[PDB]
Write a protein that binds this ligand. Structure first.
Ligand SMILES: OC[C@H]1O[C@H](O[C@H]2[C@H](O)[C@@H](O)[C@@H](O[C@H]3[C@H](O)[C@@H](O)[C@@H](O[C@H]4[C@H](O)[C@@H](O)[C@@H](O)O[C@@H]4CO)O[C@@H]3CO)O[C@@H]2CO)[C@H](O)[C@@H](O)[C@@H]1O
Ligand SMILES: OC[C@H]1O[C@H](O[C@H]2[C@H](O)[C@@H](O)[C@@H](O[C@H]3[C@H](O)[C@@H](O)[C@@H](O[C@H]4[C@H](O)[C@@H](O)[C@@H](O)O[C@@H]4CO)O[C@@H]3CO)O[C@@H]2CO)[C@H](O)[C@@H](O)[C@@H]1O
Length: 97
């Protein structure tokens, strides 16, 4: 079974070709090699909903992406997420567990 998790972070980019994405240790998160782009909303928020395996534990990070690759990793250690089995929002602050 799957669960829908909405990731959200505030980040002001400098140019229109940069964007924020999520990556992590699960296949659904790119296995640290690829990333899932977030989308920009009103008020400088980046948000997107990702389907994750239910009732498990995954490690992940926000990344900043430009010209096809990560130009900046979040400076904290890997974050842990208990995915649960109810749809939910994970609001985070860049660089802070
Ligand atoms: O064998 C492959 C490894 O795969 C996994 O490692 C992951 C890490 O868990 C992830 O966190 C990420 O690593 C990023 C890291 O998050 C990021 O901060 C950056 O680390 C740099 C850092 O800028 C700086 O301190 C510099 O000195 O070097 C650091 C490490 O290179 O970049 C890292 C990625 O390059 O992704 C890696 C895999 O790419 C797994 O957990 C490991 O056990 C495994 O060895
Ligand atoms: O003592 C620690 C720090 O305390 C204070 O920092 C505050 C900021 O003032 C707050 O605005 C917020 O910071 C957020 C920020 O709002 C959010 O946009 C994002 O910042 C990005 C930035 O948009 C982007 O352009 C790029 O430059 O990187 C930034 C992150 O590195 O995330 C920030 C936090 O992750 O909260 C912090 C406290 O956590 C004080 O102003 C700092 O000088 C001080 O170091």
């Amino acid at each position: 079974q799957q669960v829908s998790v909405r990731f959200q972070v505030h980040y002001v980019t400098s140019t229109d070709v940069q964007f924020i994405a999520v990556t992590g240790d699960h296949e659904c998160l790119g296995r640290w090699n690829t990333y899932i782009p977030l989308h920009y909303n009103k008020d400088g928020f980046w948000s997107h909903s990702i389907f994750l395996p239910a009732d498990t534990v995954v490690e992940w990070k926000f990344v900043l992406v430009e010209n096809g690759g990560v130009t900046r990793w979040e400076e904290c250690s890997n974050r842990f997420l208990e995915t649960g089995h109810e749809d939910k929002v994970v609001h985070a602050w860049w660089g802070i567990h």
